[PDB]
Design a protein around this ligand. Structure first.
Ligand SMILES: Nc1nc2c(ncn2[C@@H]2O[C@H](COP(=O)(O)OP(=O)(O)O)[C@@H](O)[C@H]2O)c(=O)[nH]1
Ligand SMILES: [Mg+2]
Length: 173
């Protein structure tokens, strides 16, 4: 029973916490076997509507750039994740963002997610820097800790709400 079914993909370098964002949001689980791209669904309510989120994650193909255009196909949202404690994963955001815009559809809602906010002492990516990038690129932005749950619920509820608010206003085209 749902009003909308939104495919949202997690993308970002290996080891940034994509899988744990997914497990935290959909199962409230964290892990310190995956045979392919996979998904979990969670229904949320936004504005009196049931939004069924179909949240996709990789099997680690991003270790290679073995991420196919098929993965992005039909995604109306992406959580573009980096690790606040690994600047390279943030440098690589531009590349994923491109890969999105490209292989994904023009109206995709993209939320930039700096994960592992618990790793304060290793912070290599200032919040201001990532926020500024997000703002310039019309991305939403949030920092999460899948470990401590910090902002996980919010990150996904926010992107689903964004997608809902956008799509629900648009007549068929
Ligand atoms: N400290 C900390 N570690 C995390 C967090 N999220 C994920 N990790 C760890 O980072 C590693 C990669 O996590 P994973 O979810 O597999 O990242 P993925 O490769 O992007 O899917 C694992 O050892 C996780 O336990 C977090 O919020 N904080
Ligand atoms: Mg993973």
């Amino acid at each position: 029973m749902y009003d909308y079914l939104f495919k949202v993909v997690l993308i970002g370098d290996s080891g940034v916490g994509k899988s744990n964002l997914l497990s935290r949001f959909t199962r409230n689980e964290f892990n310190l076997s995956t045979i392919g791209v996979e998904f979990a669904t969670r229904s949320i309510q936004v504005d009196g509507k049931t939004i069924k989120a179909q949240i996709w994650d990789t099997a680690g193909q991003e270790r290679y750039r073995r991420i196919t255009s098929a993965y992005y196909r039909g995604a109306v949202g992406a959580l573009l994740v980096y690790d606040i404690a690994k600047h390279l994963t943030y440098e690589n955001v531009e590349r994923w963002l491109k890969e999105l815009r490209d292989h994904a559809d023009s109206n995709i809602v993209i939320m930039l997610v700096g994960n592992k906010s618990d790793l304060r002492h290793l912070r290599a990516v200032p919040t201001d820097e990532a926020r500024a990038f997000a703002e310039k690129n019309n991305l939403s932005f949030i920092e999460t800790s899948a470990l401590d749950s910090t902002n996980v619920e919010e990150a996904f509820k926010n992107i689903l709400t964004e997608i809902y608010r956008i799509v629900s206003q648009k007549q068929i085209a």
